[PDB]
Design a protein around this ligand. Structure first.
Ligand SMILES: C[C@H](O)c1nc2c(N3CCCc4ncccc43)n[nH]c2nc1N1CCC2(CC1)Cc1ccccc1[C@H]2N
Length: 501
């Protein structure tokens, strides 16, 4: 796995020159857009020239101009490198050779202008055996410092290794010279440095600097929100956390074979946004629906993340709800936004009874609120009177067309009622959550609920780790939490929750 074709800090011109001077026809890279922040650009060399293709993401998916919609940039690159997905005035565009980035900004172990002292404190307080980090050197500009903790009262220690930058290559004073910090770290991960008297300088795991005490979320958000005036002050902020998270998505390219099978193509709202095989909901008693089980310790504490129903998947949706014993549905989209259908009406009108295949649904009563509408539904299997159970649909209607709400209070009030309903139902199955593609808004809601539930169970003095939780959810459905705006909104929502306690 590798995501080195993503260059986080280049301009369009620098991208052009890199491709023309260091690449060949078929070379490609991706980068964040500096003209329209929040978007991305895929730049590809072919026939001695560079083509730029815009990628847009407002919170639901990566929309490649002239191409398809994708759950992550890694899934997008893999699709066209493997599949052609024919990316294409007619001509074809080939992604042949990733043009690799040497910038370490988004490595989990790189901390930029961290001082050797700030670094010593973090290693002693939060470090364990094998924790390591890399930082720029103050005393020797251009060089770096690798610090490792090893141990089990003097049973553990920290060791500092100087990394020299000599005519564009990096070394630790002897042996091989590498073209980038990443190449050097990976080498000494596989081939550990060994001290004079036997100590192995094992690079076991990057030092954790994202886990926080929930009670201090306010000061942490203040810290993460800081805007560096110069690059001297560029330190760990929201953007650094998020793009370091995004770099880890190449580890999550799990198989989605079932959703690509012939008989399942038209059950997917978006052709290339598909459920992982190893967590998809399998329908027993066709077995396919575009949905995944999300567990916060990867039933009553679990979720189902799914897409907005299509007219030909409504019956399968209710088979899933019934089979999994779900009693609560969270829908975070209108039926239609920006003139386009996001989810078909899969519930009966108020007071009406409808049959969906072998499933029967009655809309007992609707209750309208400021931000959302609650629909009380009774689901039964035709021919089995004893199977009736109430299903509570919480339909949040005011999520903005693009981006995230300006204030998390309405979402948190909505989320609180959802949680209370679920908890009052004995033996309730997983909560169903869906938007359009079921990864963006859906991922944001589920992660917030997971984080708040830790505070519920352990109190405000507990540890939470936003990126850690997201990566775990992203291992069960592709691209859960789509954008930096949503990443920030998750922090803002946990902060708002704590302040109202
Ligand atoms: C290892 C560290 O704690 C971390 N971790 C993740 C993280 N993940 C995803 C994978 C699984 C997972 N598991 C458990 C916890 C976190 C995570 N996502 N973003 C993360 N960001 C992190 N820091 C902030 C960003 C920099 C590294 C440190 C620190 C820094 C200073 C200046 C300039 C640039 C940068 C970033 N280079």
């Amino acid at each position: 796995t590798s995501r080195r074709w993503f260059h986080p800090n280049i301009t369009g011109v620098e991208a052009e020159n890199l491709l023309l001077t260091r690449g060949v026809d078929g070379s490609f890279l991706a980068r964040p857009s500096k003209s329209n922040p929040g978007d991305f650009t895929l730049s590809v060399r072919r026939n001695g020239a560079v083509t730029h293709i815009k990628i847009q993401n407002t919170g639901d998916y990566y929309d490649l101009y002239g191409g398809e919609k994708f759950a992550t940039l890694a899934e997008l690159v893999q699709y066209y490198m493997e599949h052609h997905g024919q990316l294409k005035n007619g001509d074809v565009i080939e992604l042949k050779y990733p043009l690799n980035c040497a910038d370490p900004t988004s490595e989990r172990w790189f901390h930029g202008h961290l001082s050797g002292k700030e670094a010593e404190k973090l290693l002693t307080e939060k470090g364990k055996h094998g924790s390591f980090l890399v930082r720029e050197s103050q005393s020797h500009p251009g060089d770096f410092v690798l610090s490792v903790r090893t141990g089990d009262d003097g049973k553990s220690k920290v060791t500092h290794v100087m990394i020299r930058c000599q005519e564009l290559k990096y070394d630790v004073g002897g042996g091989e010279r590498f073209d980038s910090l990443t190449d050097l770290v990976e080498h000494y991960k596989k081939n550990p440095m060994v001290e004079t008297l036997g100590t192995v300088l094992q690079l076991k795991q990057p030092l954790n600097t994202t886990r926080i005490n929930a009670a201090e979320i306010e000061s942490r958000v203040r810290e993460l929100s800081k805007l560096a005036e110069t690059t001297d002050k560029v330190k760990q902020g929201f953007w650094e956390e998020f793009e370091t998270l995004q770099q880890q998505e190449c580890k999550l390219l799990y198989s989605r074979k079932e959703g690509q099978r012939q008989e399942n193509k038209n059950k997917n709202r978006y052709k290339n946004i598909l459920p992982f095989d190893h967590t998809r909901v399998v329908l027993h008693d066709s077995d396919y629906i575009n949905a995944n089980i999300i567990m916060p310790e990867f039933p009553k504490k679990s979720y189902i993340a799914t897409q907005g129903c299509l007219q030909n998947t409504v019956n399968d949706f209710w088979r899933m709800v019934f089979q999994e014993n779900s009693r609560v549905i969270v829908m975070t989209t209108k039926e239609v936004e920006r003139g386009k259908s996001k989810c078909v009406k899969y519930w009966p009108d108020e007071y009406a009874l409808k049959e969906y295949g072998v499933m029967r649904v009655r809309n007992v009563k609707e209750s309208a609120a400021h931000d959302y509408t609650l629909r009380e539904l009774k689901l039964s299997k035709v021919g089995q009177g004893n199977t009736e159970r109430t299903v509570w649909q919480y339909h949040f209607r005011t999520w903005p067309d693009h981006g995230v709400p300006s204030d998390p209070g309405g979402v948190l009030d909505f989320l609180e009622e959802v949680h209370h309903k679920q908890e009052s139902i004995m033996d309730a199955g997983p909560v169903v959550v869906h938007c359009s593609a079921g990864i963006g808004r859906t991922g944001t809601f589920i992660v917030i609920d997971i984080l708040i539930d830790i505070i519920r169970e352990k109190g405000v003095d507990c540890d939470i780790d936003v990126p850690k939780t997201i990566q775990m959810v992203r291992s069960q459905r592709s691209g859960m939490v789509q954008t930096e705006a949503q990443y920030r909104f998750i922090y803002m929502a946990v902060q708002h929750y704590i302040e109202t306690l």
